[PDB]
């Protein structure tokens, strides 16, 4: 998975988390962790809930 679209707003609460708003498109860097994916938005890196995005493919 390379790209995914946010289904809900996600608020980053820890240093390693990537916040986003619903409808934003995240570059997916890791999708092997089933709970938390690693990605990029606004050139910023962080982890976010896999269940908060829908892969685009």
């Amino acid at each position: 998975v390379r790209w995914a679209r946010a289904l809900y707003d996600f608020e980053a609460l820890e240093e390693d988390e990537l916040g986003f708003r619903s409808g934003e498109v995240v570059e997916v860097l890791d999708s092997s962790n089933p709970s938390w994916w690693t990605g990029r938005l606004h050139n910023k890196l962080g982890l976010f809930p896999a269940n908060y995005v829908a892969p685009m493919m």
Partner: peptide
């Protein structure tokens, strides 16, 4: 209406 839960933060580490 309400968004789903965020998974436990401990699962950010490897092995979920």
């Amino acid at each position: 209406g309400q968004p789903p839960l965020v998974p436990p933060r401990k699962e950010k580490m490897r092995g979920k």
